[PDB]
Amino acid sequence: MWRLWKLYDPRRVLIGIFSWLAVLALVIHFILLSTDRFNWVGGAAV
Amino acid sequence: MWRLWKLYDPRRVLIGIFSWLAVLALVIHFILLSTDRFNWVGGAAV
Amino acid sequence: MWRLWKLYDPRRVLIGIFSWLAVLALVIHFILLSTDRFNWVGGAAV
Amino acid sequence: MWRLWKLYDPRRVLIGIFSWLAVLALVIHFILLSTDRFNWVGGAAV
Amino acid sequence: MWRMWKILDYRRTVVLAHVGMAVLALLIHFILLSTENFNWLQGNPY
Amino acid sequence: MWRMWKILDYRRTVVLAHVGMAVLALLIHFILLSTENFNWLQGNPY
Amino acid sequence: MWRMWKILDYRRTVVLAHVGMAVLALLIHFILLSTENFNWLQGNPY
Amino acid sequence: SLTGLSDEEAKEFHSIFMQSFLIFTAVAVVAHFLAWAWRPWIPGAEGY
Amino acid sequence: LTGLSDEEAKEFHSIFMQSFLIFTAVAVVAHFLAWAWRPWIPGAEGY
Amino acid sequence: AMLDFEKKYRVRGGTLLGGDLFDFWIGPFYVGIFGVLTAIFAVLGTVLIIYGASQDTFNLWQISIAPPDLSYGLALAPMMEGGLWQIITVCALGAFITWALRQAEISKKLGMGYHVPVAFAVAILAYATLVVFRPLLMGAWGHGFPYGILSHLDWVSNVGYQYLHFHYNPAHMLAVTFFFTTTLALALHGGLILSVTNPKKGEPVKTAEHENTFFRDVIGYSIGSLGIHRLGLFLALNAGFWSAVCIIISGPFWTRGWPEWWNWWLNVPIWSWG
Amino acid sequence: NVSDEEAKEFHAMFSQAFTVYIGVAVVAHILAWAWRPWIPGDEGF
Amino acid sequence: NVSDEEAKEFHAMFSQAFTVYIGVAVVAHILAWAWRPWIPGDEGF
Amino acid sequence: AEYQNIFTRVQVRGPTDPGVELPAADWPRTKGATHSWLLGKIGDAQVGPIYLGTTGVMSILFGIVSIVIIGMNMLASVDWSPLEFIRQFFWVALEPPPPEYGLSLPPLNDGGWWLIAGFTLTLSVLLWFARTYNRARALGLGTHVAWAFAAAIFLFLAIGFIWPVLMGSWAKSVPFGIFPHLDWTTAFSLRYGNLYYNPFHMLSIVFLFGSALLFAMHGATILAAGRYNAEREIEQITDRGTAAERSALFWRWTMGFNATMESIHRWGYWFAILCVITGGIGILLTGTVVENWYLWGVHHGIAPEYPEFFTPAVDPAA
Amino acid sequence: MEGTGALTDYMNVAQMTLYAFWLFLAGLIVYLRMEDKREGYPLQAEANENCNRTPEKKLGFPAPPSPKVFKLADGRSIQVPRAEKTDYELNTQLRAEPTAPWDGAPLEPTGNPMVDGLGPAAWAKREDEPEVTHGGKQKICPLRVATEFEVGMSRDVARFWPEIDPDPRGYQVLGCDGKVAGKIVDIWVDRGELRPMYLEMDLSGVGSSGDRVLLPINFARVGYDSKVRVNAITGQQFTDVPRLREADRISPQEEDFITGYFGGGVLYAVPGRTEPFL
Ligand code: BCL
Ligand code: BCL
Ligand code: BCL
Ligand code: BCL
Ligand SMILES: CC[C@H]1c2cc3[nH]c4c(c3C)C(=O)[C@H](C(=O)OC)c4c3nc(cc4[nH]c(cc(n2)[C@@H]1C)c(C(C)=O)c4C)[C@@H](C)[C@@H]3CCC(=O)OC/C=C(/C)CCC[C@H](C)CCC[C@H](C)CCCC(C)C
Ligand SMILES: CC[C@H]1c2cc3[nH]c4c(c3C)C(=O)[C@H](C(=O)OC)c4c3nc(cc4[nH]c(cc(n2)[C@@H]1C)c(C(C)=O)c4C)[C@@H](C)[C@@H]3CCC(=O)OC/C=C(/C)CCC[C@H](C)CCC[C@H](C)CCCC(C)C
Ligand SMILES: COC(C)(C)C/C=C/C(C)=C/C=C/C(C)=C/C=C/C(C)=C/C=C\C=C(C)\C=C\C=C(C)\C=C\C=C(C)\C=C\CC(C)(C)OC
Ligand SMILES: [Fe+3]
Ligand SMILES: [Mg+2]
C-alpha cells in the first residue's frame, strides 16, 4: 500500500484529501445547523 | 431568337426554367387548395 | 439494369436506400400509431 | 486665427460643422414641433 | 430525346430525380391524409 | 433604340428584367387576390 | 465659391447631395402626411 | 458566343426548346380546358 | 465510372434484386397479415 | 465578376450531390444542387407567405402565418387554418438544411473545415426545436411560432408567460448569459483587432504581442488569437444550444412556474436553516 | 465594346420579345377591363 | 464531352425506368379513382 | 477524421511574458505570472501579469465598496445567516429607494445604501473605462475597446441613472440582486406595455442576435480556415494570405457578398455596440415620450389583429 | 394622440428617433460595405462574362473606397489593396481549363493542381522575408534555434499523463492511406502566439532521412499511439511538399506554399475525393 506514494504525488493527494475534508466538514456542520434537533447554537429542545 | 443561346448556357436556363416551373406549379396548386371553390380534394360545393 | 452499378458506388447506393427505408418505416409506423384505427398498442376498437 | 487651418484639415472641420449644423437644425425644428406654442404645422392658437 | 443527357449529366439527374420525387410523393400522400374524403386511414364516409 | 445595348450589358439586363418582372407579376396578381372585387378565385360580387 | 470644389470632392458631394435631399424631401412630405391640416391625401378641412 | 455553342448548335437547341415549350404549353392548354369545364374561374357580375 | 467490372456489377445486380425480391416478398406477406387484421381501404360508408 | 484573387479558387469538385450538373457560379453565388433546392424552397416559402399576406393584410409588420389549432394535433391542417404554416415550415426546414449542405460543399471546395455548416446546424437545431421537437413532444404543431414579424413576438411573450416568469428558467438564464457573453466577447475581439490594425494615427500597426499585453494589462489574462475564435464559437453555439434546451423543457419537461423550479435549491439540507 | 451590328442584333432580339410581351399584356388588360373595370366612380364600383 | 452513343444508352435506361414508373402510377390512379373520384361535382362528392 | 481545431493538442511553454514595455510613467506590472495547461487547451496558457495603475486601483476601491455595501445589505437582509444567504442567494438584493423620495437622498436603510452602491459602482466602471483607454494608448493601440466599453456603460447608465433621473425617482432604477433585477426587467415590460413593441428594443435584439450570429460565423470561419493560419489576423490584414482569401470567398460564394479580414471585425464591433446603444436609447424613450408601447404600436399600425377565438372579457369597472 | 413626445397629429418623438437611427444605420451599412471592399476590388469581369467580350473592372455598390495605408513597425508603408498581390493574380497563367466556356463554369486543372496552386491548393502572393517579433527575434522558428521553448505546457501533465500533453517529436507520420511518410524531427513555434505552427519531419518513409519538410499543425492529427495522421495528403505526396529556401526560416510566402499544398489534398489527394456522394 506504500507503493501508492511512488505512483501518486503525495502533495496532490494531501491537497485533494484536505480539500475533501474541508468541504465535507463544512457541509456536515451546515447540515446539522439546518436541522432543528442538531442546531446546537439554536438551542432547540428534544 | 436562336441567338439567345449564344448568350445563355442551355444547362443554366434549363435549371432556371425548371426551378421556376416547379415553384410556380406548387404555388398555384397550393393556392387552389386554399380556396374552397377549387379545393378538389376538399370537395366543396358550388 | 446491371449497368447502373457501373455509374454508382454500390456501398453509397445501399447507404442511401437503407437510410430511406429507415426513415420511411419509422414514419409509417408512427403514422399508424397516430390513427384511432391502426394504433395496435393503443387498443383501438373498430 | 487663420493658423487654425494648418492645425486641422479644412475639409474635416467643415464636414464636422455641417453635420453638427444639420443635426442641430433638425433637433431644434422638432423641439419646436413638440411644443404647443411653436408648432407651425399644427396650427395652435396662442 | 437522348439529346437531353448531353446537356444534363444523366447519373447526377437520376439521384436528383429520386430525392425530388420522394419529397413530392410524401407531400401528396400527406395532403390526402389531411383531407376528409381521402384519408384512407381514418376512413370517413365518401 | 439599339444604342441602349452599347451602354447596358444586354445579357445581364435580360436576366434582371425576367427576375424583376417575375416579382412584379406575382406582386400584382397577389394584390388582386387581396381585394374583394378582383379576387377571381373567391368570386365575390362586383 | 468654386474653391469649394478644391476642398470638397465634387463627384462625391453630388451623390451625397442627391441622397441627402432624397432623405430630406421624403421626410418633409411624410411630415405633412402625418399632419391633419396638410395631408393632401386625406383632405381634412383646413 | 460566350457559351461555346456554335450557330448551328444554338439553332438545334432552339428547335428542341421551342418544340418542348409548345408541347408543355399544349398539355397546359388541355389541362385548363378540362379545368374550366369542371369549374370556371372567371366570376360574373353577381359572383359565382 | 466507379471502379467495377462487368462481372462484379452483374454479380451485384443479381444479389441486389434477390435481396430486393426477398425484402418485398416479406413486405407483401406483412401487408397480407395487416389487411386481414384491419383493411385500410374504406368503402363509401366508411369503417 | 469575380474578386481579383478568386479565379484560382473556382475549381470543380467538392459537392455532396449533383456533381458536375450543378457545380457552377451565378455571379458571386455558388449554386450547387443544394443551391437549386434552397432557392426553390426559399421562393416557394416566401411566395406562400406573400399569399398568406394577401388573404389577411399586406402590412409588413402585421403579416402573420399562424400554425393550426392544438385541436388538429399532429395532423396536417387545411391551408387557411394552419396548413399553409405547415407547408412553409417544411419549406423553411428544407431551405435551412440545404443551406448548410451548400456551405459544406463550399467548405470542401476551399479546403476549409466544416465548422460553419456545423455551427449553423445549431441554429437549425434551435429552429427545429421551436417548430418540430417541442410541438412533437407536446403533441400538436400548433405550439410552433407564427411566421410574422410582430405576431411571433406575441407568441414569444405568451409562451414565456405560460410559466409565469421565464427569467427564472435555469436553461434560459444560462442561454442569456452566453448571449450576453458572446457580444461582450465580440466587442472585445472586434475592438482589439481594430485597435491593433488601426492604432493612434502615426504609430505603426502593432503585433500579436501587443494584443496579449493589452488584455493581460486590463484583466490579467489573454486568451490569444486562436483562443478567442474558439471562445466566440463556443459562446455563440452554447447560446444557440441552451436556447433550444430552455424552450424544449418549457412544457414537455416543466409545466409549472419557472420560479417554482428553484424550490429544490431552497430545500437543500445543507442550508435549510429551518 | 460591342459593335453596331451586335447592338442591333440584340435590339432585334429584344424587339421580338417586347412586342409579344406587350401584345399579350395589352390583350390581357382589354379582357380584364371587359370583365371588371378597376377604376371606380364617385359611388364606387 | 458525353458522346451520342452513351447519351442514347442513358436514354435507353431512362426510358425503361420511366415507362415502368408511369405504368404503376397510371394503374395506381385508376385504382384510386375507382375507389374515390377526386373531382367534385356541383354538389361535391 | 480531421483535426477540428477545437482544442490545442501540442503545446509549447517558453518563459513567462513580461509584456510590451510601457512608457516610463506607468506603474510596474505585477510580478506574478503562471502557465495553465487547461487554459492552453483553449488558447493562451499564461495567466498574468496584470497592470495596476492609478485608475485601475481606484476603480477596484470603488468597486469593492460597492460590492461590500451590496453584500452586507444582502447579508443583513437574511439576518446575517450565511446559510440563509446561500439559500436566498439569487433572491437577495439591495433595494432602490421607494417612490416617495423622488430624486432626493433617501435614508440609508430606505434606499440610501442603494444610491451609495450605485454611485461607487458607476465610478468604478467609469474609472475602468479610463483604465481600458489608457492601456490601449500606453501600448500605442486604438481606443476601440474603451469606446465599446463606453457603449456598454451608456446602457448601464441609461437603465440605472439617466432614465430614473428623467422619470424623477430613484425607485424606477434596478435593485442589486440576481432574481430581483430580473423582476425589475419583467416589471419594466409589464409597466410600459410589452417592451417587445419598443422599436429600439427590437433593434437592440437585432444586433444582439446579430452579434451571436456574427461571432458564430466569424469564429467558425477562422477555425475552418485555421489550416491556413487564419487566426493570425493581423498578418492576414497587412499581408493577405490564402486564409483571408478563402474566408472571403467562402461567404461570397454563399451569400453573394463578403467582408475582409479587417472589415469583419468592424462588423462585429458595430453590431456589439449598436445592440447596447439602441438598447439604451429605447430605455430612455419609454416612460418619457411613450407610455404604452403596445398602444404606440397600434398607433403606428404594427400590432397584429387576431380573429375571435374566445369570448372577450369586459372590464367591470369600465 | 396627445401627451409628451407628440410632434404632430401622428408623429411622436419615439418614431422620429427611430427614423434618425434608420438614417444612421443605412450610412453605417454603406461604410461597413465600403470597408468590405478594400481587398479584392475592383472585380475582374473576364471576357466571357460580357457581351462586349473585353475584360472590365466592376466596382459594385457601394464603390470601393480610397486605398488604405498601413504603417508597419519595421519602417515601411503598405497601401491596401497591395499592388504586387493584385499584379501577381492578374498576370499568372493558371494550369487549369474551364469546363465550359461560359462565365461561372468551374476550372478543370490540367497538370497537378496540388503543385500548380488551383482551388484548395491555391496560395496567396505574400512577402518572402520571414516575420519578426516586436523584440526583433525570428517569429516562427524551430525548437533547435528557439531553446527557451519546451514541449508541453505543464511538466507534471507531460510527465505523468503524456497522452493529453504530447511531445510529438520522434513520432511517425502517416498519410491519408496509412503510408508511413516519415518521422517528426522538430517542432516550429510562433514566438508571437506561443503555439506550434508546423511539425518538421524527415521523409525517410518515402524519401531520404536528410530531406526535411514542414507539416502544418492544423493538418496533423497527433494521436495517442506515437503517430501523427495526415488525412490531407497521401504519404507518398509528402515528397512534393514545398521546401524551405532556408533550412531554419520560413517566410509568409512559404507558409502559404506549404498550407496550400496540404489544402490541395482536400480535393486532389486521392481519386474520388473531388466526386460527390451520389
Ligand atoms: C415573456 C418573455 C420572456 C422570454 C420568453 C422566451 C421564449 C418563448 C423564447 C425565448 C428565447 C430566448 N430568450 Mg427569452 N424571454 C424573456 C426575456 C429575455 C431577455 C431579457 C433581456 O429579458 C433576453 C436577453 C432573452 C434571451 C433569450 C435567448 C436565450 C433566446 C432567444 C435566442 C434564440 O432562441 O436563439 C435561437 C435562434 C434561432 C431559433 C434562429 C434560427 C435561425 C434559422 C435556422 C435561420 C433563419 C434564416 C432566415 C429565414 C433568413 C432570412 C432571409 C435572409 C435574411 C435573406 N430573453 C422574457 C422574460 N424567450 C427563445 C429560445 O430560447 O428558443 C430557442 C424562445 O423560444
Ligand atoms: C424565348 C426565350 C425566352 C425569352 C426570351 C427573351 C428575350 C431575348 C427578351 C426577353 C424579354 C422579356 N421577357 Mg422573355 N423569354 C421567354 C418567354 C417569356 C415569357 C413566357 C411566359 O413565355 C414571359 C412572361 C417573358 C417576359 C419577358 C420580360 C421580362 C421581357 C420583356 C419585357 C421587357 O422588355 O422588360 C423591360 C423592363 C425592365 C428592364 C424594367 C426592369 C424592372 C426592375 C427589376 C424593377 C422592378 C421592381 C419590382 C416591381 C420590385 C417588386 C416589388 C418588391 C416588393 C420590392 N418572357 C423565353 C423563356 N425574353 C426582353 C428583355 O428582357 O429586355 C430587357 C428581351 O430582350
Ligand atoms: C434497381 C434499380 C433502381 C432504380 C433505377 C432507375 C434508373 C436507371 C432510373 C430510375 C428513374 C426513376 N426512378 Mg428508380 N430505381 C429503382 C426503383 C424505383 C422505385 C421502387 C420503389 O422500386 C421507385 C418508386 C423509383 C422511382 C424513380 C423515379 C424517381 C424515376 C422515374 C421517373 C422520372 O423519370 O423522374 C423524372 C422526374 C423529375 C426529374 C421531376 C423532378 C421533381 C422536382 C425535383 C420537384 C422538386 C420540388 C419539391 C417537390 C419541392 C417540395 C416542397 C414541399 C412543400 C416540401 N425507382 C431501383 C432502386 N430508376 C429514372 C430517373 O430518375 O431519370 C431522371 C431513371 O433513369
Ligand atoms: C419580460 C422582459 C421583456 C424584456 C425587458 C427588457 C428591459 C427592461 C431591458 C431589456 C433590454 C434588452 N433586451 Mg429585453 N425584454 C424582453 C425580451 C427579450 C428577448 C426575448 C427573445 O424574449 C431578447 C433576446 C431580449 C434582449 C434584450 C437586449 C437586446 C437588451 C439587453 C442588451 C444587453 O446586452 O444588456 C446587458 C448589458 C448591460 C446592461 C451593460 C453592462 C455594462 C456594465 C458597465 C457592466 C458592469 C459590470 C459590473 C462592473 C460588474 C460588477 C457589479 C457588482 C458585482 C454588482 N429581450 C421582454 C419583452 N429587456 C435592455 C435594453 O437595452 O432595452 C432596450 C433593458 O433595459
Ligand atoms: C446558433 C448561433 C447563432 C447563429 C449562427 C449561424 N447563423 C447562420 C450561420 C451560423 C453559423 C450561417 O452560416 C448562416 C449564414 O449563411 O449566415 C450568413 C446563418 C444564417 N442565419 C440567418 C439568420 C438568423 N440567425 C439567427 C440566430 C443565430 N444564428 C444564433 C444566435 C436568427 C435569429 C435569432 O432570429 C436569424 C434570423 C441567415 C442570415 C443565415 C441562413 C439563411 C438561410 O438559410 O437562408 C436560406 C434562404 C432563405 C431566403 C430562407 C427562406 C426560408 C423560408 C422558405 C421562408 C421563411 C420561413 C421563416 C420561418 C419565416 C420566419 C419569419 C418570422 C419569424 C418573422
Ligand atoms: C458592447 C456591449 C457588451 C459589453 C462590452 C464590454 N464590456 C467590457 C468591455 C467591453 C468592450 C471592457 O473593455 C471591459 C473589460 O474589462 O472587459 C474584459 C468590460 C467589462 N464588462 C464587464 C461586465 C459585464 N459586461 C456586460 C455586458 C456587455 N459588455 C455587453 C453585452 C455585462 C452584463 C451582460 O450584465 C456584465 C456583467 C466587466 C467584467 C468589465 C468591466 C470591469 C469593471 O468595470 O471593473 C471595475 C468594476 C468593479 C465592480 C470592480 C471589481 C473589483 C474586484 C471585485 C476586486 C476583487 C478583490 C481583489 C482585488 C482580488 C484579488 C484577491 C486577493 C485576495 C489577492
Ligand atoms: C457580505 O458580503 C461580503 C462583504 C462578504 C462580500 C459579498 C458580496 C456579494 C455577495 C455581492 C453580491 C452582489 C450581487 C449579486 C450583485 C448583483 C448585481 C446585479 C445583477 C446588478 C444588475 C443591475 C443593476 C444595475 C443596472 C444598477 C444600476 C445602478 C446605477 C447605474 C446607479 C447609479 C447611481 C448613481 C450614478 C448615483 C449617483 C449619486 C448622486 C450623487 C448623483 O445622487 C445624488
Ligand atoms: Fe477575428
Ligand atoms: Mg423587486
Short mmCIF file of N, CA and C in Angstrom, two decimals, chain M residues 1-3 5 9-14 35 37 41 200 203 226-229 231-232 238-242 245-246 252 257-260 262-263 266-267 278 288-290 296 299-300, chain N residues 1 4 10 12 15 17 21 31 33 35-36 39 41 43 68 78 82 85 120 122 126-127 139 150 152-153 155 163-164 166 193 195-196 198 218-219 221-222 224 231 255-256 259 263:
data_model
loop_
_atom_site.label_atom_id
_atom_site.label_comp_id
_atom_site.label_asym_id
_atom_site.label_seq_id
_atom_site.Cartn_x
_atom_site.Cartn_y
_atom_site.Cartn_z
N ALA M 1 -12.22 12.03 -40.36
CA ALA M 1 -11.16 12.10 -39.37
C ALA M 1 -10.19 13.23 -39.69
N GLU M 2 -10.40 14.39 -39.07
CA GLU M 2 -9.56 15.55 -39.29
C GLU M 2 -9.47 16.35 -38.00
N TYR M 3 -8.37 17.08 -37.84
CA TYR M 3 -8.23 17.98 -36.70
C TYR M 3 -9.27 19.09 -36.78
N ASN M 5 -9.66 21.68 -34.74
CA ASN M 5 -9.21 22.97 -34.22
C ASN M 5 -10.07 23.43 -33.05
N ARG M 9 -3.67 20.56 -29.31
CA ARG M 9 -3.10 19.26 -28.96
C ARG M 9 -1.70 19.40 -28.38
N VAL M 10 -0.77 19.92 -29.18
CA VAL M 10 0.62 20.08 -28.78
C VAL M 10 0.81 21.51 -28.29
N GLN M 11 1.40 21.65 -27.11
CA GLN M 11 1.66 22.95 -26.52
C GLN M 11 3.16 23.14 -26.31
N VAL M 12 3.59 24.40 -26.38
CA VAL M 12 4.97 24.77 -26.12
C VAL M 12 4.97 25.89 -25.08
N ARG M 13 5.81 25.76 -24.07
CA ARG M 13 5.91 26.74 -23.00
C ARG M 13 7.28 27.39 -23.04
N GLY M 14 7.31 28.70 -23.27
CA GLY M 14 8.52 29.47 -23.14
C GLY M 14 8.56 30.17 -21.80
N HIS M 35 1.63 29.62 -16.00
CA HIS M 35 1.10 28.94 -17.18
C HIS M 35 0.14 27.85 -16.74
N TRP M 37 -2.07 24.60 -18.02
CA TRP M 37 -2.27 23.63 -19.09
C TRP M 37 -3.71 23.66 -19.59
N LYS M 41 -5.20 24.58 -23.58
CA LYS M 41 -6.00 23.78 -24.49
C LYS M 41 -6.92 24.65 -25.33
N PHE M 200 -36.71 50.28 -30.62
CA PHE M 200 -35.30 50.21 -30.27
C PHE M 200 -34.98 48.95 -29.47
N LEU M 203 -34.57 46.63 -32.32
CA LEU M 203 -33.27 46.83 -32.94
C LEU M 203 -32.14 46.31 -32.07
N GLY M 226 -8.35 27.76 -40.17
CA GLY M 226 -7.17 27.62 -39.34
C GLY M 226 -6.09 26.76 -39.94
N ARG M 227 -6.45 25.89 -40.90
CA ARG M 227 -5.44 25.15 -41.65
C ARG M 227 -4.45 26.09 -42.32
N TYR M 228 -4.90 27.27 -42.73
CA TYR M 228 -4.09 28.24 -43.44
C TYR M 228 -3.69 29.42 -42.55
N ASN M 229 -3.65 29.19 -41.24
CA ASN M 229 -3.17 30.18 -40.27
C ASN M 229 -4.05 31.43 -40.28
N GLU M 231 -6.13 32.45 -37.86
CA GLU M 231 -6.22 33.14 -36.57
C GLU M 231 -5.17 34.23 -36.43
N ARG M 232 -4.07 34.16 -37.18
CA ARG M 232 -3.12 35.26 -37.23
C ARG M 232 -3.71 36.39 -38.07
N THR M 238 -2.56 43.00 -42.93
CA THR M 238 -1.48 43.73 -43.58
C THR M 238 -0.91 42.96 -44.77
N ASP M 239 -0.94 41.63 -44.73
CA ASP M 239 -0.44 40.80 -45.83
C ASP M 239 -1.45 39.68 -46.06
N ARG M 240 -2.40 39.92 -46.96
CA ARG M 240 -3.47 38.97 -47.23
C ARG M 240 -2.93 37.62 -47.67
N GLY M 241 -3.09 36.60 -46.83
CA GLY M 241 -2.75 35.24 -47.19
C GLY M 241 -3.93 34.52 -47.80
N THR M 242 -3.73 33.23 -48.06
CA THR M 242 -4.81 32.44 -48.65
C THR M 242 -5.94 32.21 -47.66
N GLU M 245 -8.26 35.03 -48.17
CA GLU M 245 -8.91 34.85 -49.46
C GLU M 245 -10.00 33.79 -49.39
N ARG M 246 -9.70 32.63 -48.79
CA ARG M 246 -10.69 31.57 -48.69
C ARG M 246 -11.85 31.98 -47.79
N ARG M 252 -18.64 34.93 -49.88
CA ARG M 252 -19.08 35.47 -51.16
C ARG M 252 -19.83 34.42 -51.97
N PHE M 257 -21.98 38.33 -50.99
CA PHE M 257 -21.11 39.40 -50.54
C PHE M 257 -20.24 38.90 -49.40
N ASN M 258 -19.19 39.66 -49.11
CA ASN M 258 -18.21 39.25 -48.12
C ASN M 258 -17.54 40.49 -47.55
N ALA M 259 -16.87 40.31 -46.42
CA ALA M 259 -16.05 41.33 -45.80
C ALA M 259 -14.58 41.04 -46.09
N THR M 260 -13.69 41.79 -45.46
CA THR M 260 -12.28 41.46 -45.42
C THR M 260 -11.94 40.91 -44.03
N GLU M 262 -10.01 42.44 -41.94
CA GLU M 262 -10.16 43.59 -41.05
C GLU M 262 -11.62 44.00 -40.91
N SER M 263 -12.38 43.94 -42.01
CA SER M 263 -13.72 44.53 -42.01
C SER M 263 -14.73 43.70 -41.24
N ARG M 266 -14.86 45.05 -37.93
CA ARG M 266 -15.68 46.25 -37.88
C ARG M 266 -17.16 45.89 -37.79
N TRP M 267 -17.60 44.90 -38.57
CA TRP M 267 -18.99 44.45 -38.48
C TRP M 267 -19.31 43.94 -37.09
N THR M 278 -28.64 51.11 -29.05
CA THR M 278 -30.08 51.15 -29.31
C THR M 278 -30.87 50.74 -28.08
N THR M 288 -40.81 58.36 -20.88
CA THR M 288 -40.53 59.77 -21.13
C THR M 288 -41.34 60.31 -22.30
N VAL M 289 -41.36 59.60 -23.43
CA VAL M 289 -42.12 60.01 -24.59
C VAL M 289 -43.06 58.92 -25.10
N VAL M 290 -43.05 57.74 -24.49
CA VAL M 290 -44.03 56.69 -24.80
C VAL M 290 -44.49 56.08 -23.49
N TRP M 296 -48.68 52.41 -28.60
CA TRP M 296 -47.85 53.07 -29.61
C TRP M 296 -47.74 52.21 -30.86
N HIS M 299 -50.92 52.50 -32.70
CA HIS M 299 -50.97 53.82 -33.33
C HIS M 299 -50.21 53.84 -34.65
N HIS M 300 -49.10 53.10 -34.74
CA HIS M 300 -48.29 53.06 -35.94
C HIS M 300 -48.60 51.86 -36.82
N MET N 1 -53.88 61.51 -30.61
CA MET N 1 -52.72 61.18 -29.78
C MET N 1 -52.13 62.43 -29.13
N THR N 4 -46.88 64.04 -23.81
CA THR N 4 -45.49 64.40 -24.06
C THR N 4 -44.88 63.47 -25.09
N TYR N 10 -49.85 62.72 -35.73
CA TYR N 10 -49.44 61.33 -35.83
C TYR N 10 -48.00 61.08 -35.41
N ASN N 12 -44.49 61.26 -33.34
CA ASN N 12 -44.04 61.41 -31.97
C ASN N 12 -42.53 61.23 -31.91
N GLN N 15 -40.97 57.81 -32.64
CA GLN N 15 -40.98 57.45 -34.05
C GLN N 15 -39.88 58.18 -34.83
N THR N 17 -37.08 59.47 -33.54
CA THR N 17 -35.80 58.94 -33.09
C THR N 17 -35.48 57.63 -33.80
N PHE N 21 -32.27 56.78 -36.39
CA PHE N 21 -31.37 55.64 -36.37
C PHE N 21 -31.37 54.89 -37.69
N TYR N 31 -20.87 52.42 -44.97
CA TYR N 31 -19.48 52.49 -44.53
C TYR N 31 -18.89 51.09 -44.34
N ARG N 33 -19.89 48.30 -45.74
CA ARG N 33 -19.75 47.68 -47.05
C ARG N 33 -18.52 48.20 -47.79
N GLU N 35 -15.78 49.26 -46.32
CA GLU N 35 -14.66 48.61 -45.67
C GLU N 35 -14.50 47.17 -46.15
N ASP N 36 -15.59 46.52 -46.54
CA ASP N 36 -15.53 45.17 -47.07
C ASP N 36 -14.83 45.09 -48.42
N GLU N 39 -10.17 44.68 -50.07
CA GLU N 39 -9.41 43.54 -50.57
C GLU N 39 -10.22 42.89 -51.68
N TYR N 41 -10.98 44.25 -54.78
CA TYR N 41 -11.71 45.14 -55.66
C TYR N 41 -10.76 46.07 -56.39
N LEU N 43 -13.64 44.36 -59.15
CA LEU N 43 -13.81 42.99 -59.61
C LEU N 43 -13.33 42.84 -61.05
N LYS N 68 -6.10 52.25 -48.53
CA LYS N 68 -5.72 52.43 -47.14
C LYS N 68 -4.23 52.19 -46.97
N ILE N 78 2.60 50.24 -46.39
CA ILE N 78 1.96 49.38 -47.38
C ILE N 78 0.57 49.91 -47.66
N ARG N 82 -2.83 45.83 -51.94
CA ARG N 82 -1.43 45.85 -52.36
C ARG N 82 -1.33 45.72 -53.87
N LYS N 85 0.28 42.11 -55.01
CA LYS N 85 -0.61 40.97 -54.85
C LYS N 85 -1.66 40.94 -55.95
N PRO N 120 -8.37 24.57 -53.70
CA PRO N 120 -7.89 24.43 -52.32
C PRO N 120 -6.38 24.42 -52.20
N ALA N 122 -4.51 26.55 -53.79
CA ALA N 122 -4.04 27.87 -54.16
C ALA N 122 -3.34 28.56 -53.00
N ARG N 126 2.59 36.58 -51.06
CA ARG N 126 2.98 37.17 -49.79
C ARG N 126 4.46 37.50 -49.81
N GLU N 127 4.90 38.27 -48.83
CA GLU N 127 6.30 38.66 -48.74
C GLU N 127 7.17 37.45 -48.46
N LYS N 139 10.20 35.22 -35.86
CA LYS N 139 8.87 34.96 -35.33
C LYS N 139 8.58 33.46 -35.25
N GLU N 150 10.05 24.77 -24.37
CA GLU N 150 9.95 23.35 -24.10
C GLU N 150 8.57 22.85 -24.51
N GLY N 152 5.15 20.96 -24.14
CA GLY N 152 4.26 20.65 -23.03
C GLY N 152 4.08 21.82 -22.09
N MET N 153 2.84 22.29 -21.94
CA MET N 153 2.59 23.45 -21.10
C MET N 153 2.89 23.16 -19.64
N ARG N 155 4.82 20.53 -16.99
CA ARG N 155 5.77 19.43 -16.85
C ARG N 155 5.12 18.21 -16.22
N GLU N 163 -0.43 11.54 -22.54
CA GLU N 163 -1.39 11.44 -23.63
C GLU N 163 -2.02 12.79 -23.95
N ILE N 164 -2.42 13.54 -22.92
CA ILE N 164 -3.11 14.81 -23.14
C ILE N 164 -2.16 15.99 -23.17
N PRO N 166 1.06 15.86 -25.23
CA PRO N 166 2.01 15.06 -26.01
C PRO N 166 3.25 15.85 -26.42
N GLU N 193 2.57 34.06 -30.87
CA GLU N 193 1.38 33.40 -30.33
C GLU N 193 1.71 32.21 -29.45
N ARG N 195 2.64 29.11 -30.02
CA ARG N 195 1.94 27.91 -30.45
C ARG N 195 2.79 27.16 -31.47
N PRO N 196 2.69 25.83 -31.49
CA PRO N 196 3.32 25.05 -32.57
C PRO N 196 2.61 25.32 -33.89
N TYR N 198 4.17 24.28 -37.11
CA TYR N 198 4.50 23.22 -38.06
C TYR N 198 5.23 22.10 -37.34
N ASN N 218 -2.19 22.26 -38.01
CA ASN N 218 -3.63 22.16 -38.20
C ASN N 218 -4.02 21.12 -39.23
N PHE N 219 -3.05 20.57 -39.96
CA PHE N 219 -3.30 19.46 -40.88
C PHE N 219 -2.87 18.13 -40.31
N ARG N 221 -3.10 15.17 -37.23
CA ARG N 221 -3.83 14.55 -36.12
C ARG N 221 -2.81 13.81 -35.27
N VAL N 222 -2.45 14.39 -34.13
CA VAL N 222 -1.44 13.83 -33.24
C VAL N 222 -2.16 12.87 -32.30
N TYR N 224 -2.64 9.23 -29.85
CA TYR N 224 -2.14 8.74 -28.58
C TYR N 224 -1.25 7.52 -28.73
N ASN N 231 -4.67 13.30 -42.79
CA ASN N 231 -5.77 12.98 -43.69
C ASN N 231 -5.76 13.85 -44.95
N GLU N 255 4.83 29.92 -46.01
CA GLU N 255 3.73 29.39 -45.22
C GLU N 255 2.51 29.11 -46.09
N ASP N 256 2.21 30.02 -47.02
CA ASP N 256 1.11 29.79 -47.96
C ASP N 256 1.41 28.64 -48.90
N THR N 259 0.89 25.34 -46.55
CA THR N 259 -0.52 25.13 -46.20
C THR N 259 -1.38 24.98 -47.45
N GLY N 263 -3.66 21.72 -48.22
CA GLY N 263 -5.05 22.01 -48.53
C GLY N 263 -5.47 21.51 -49.89
#
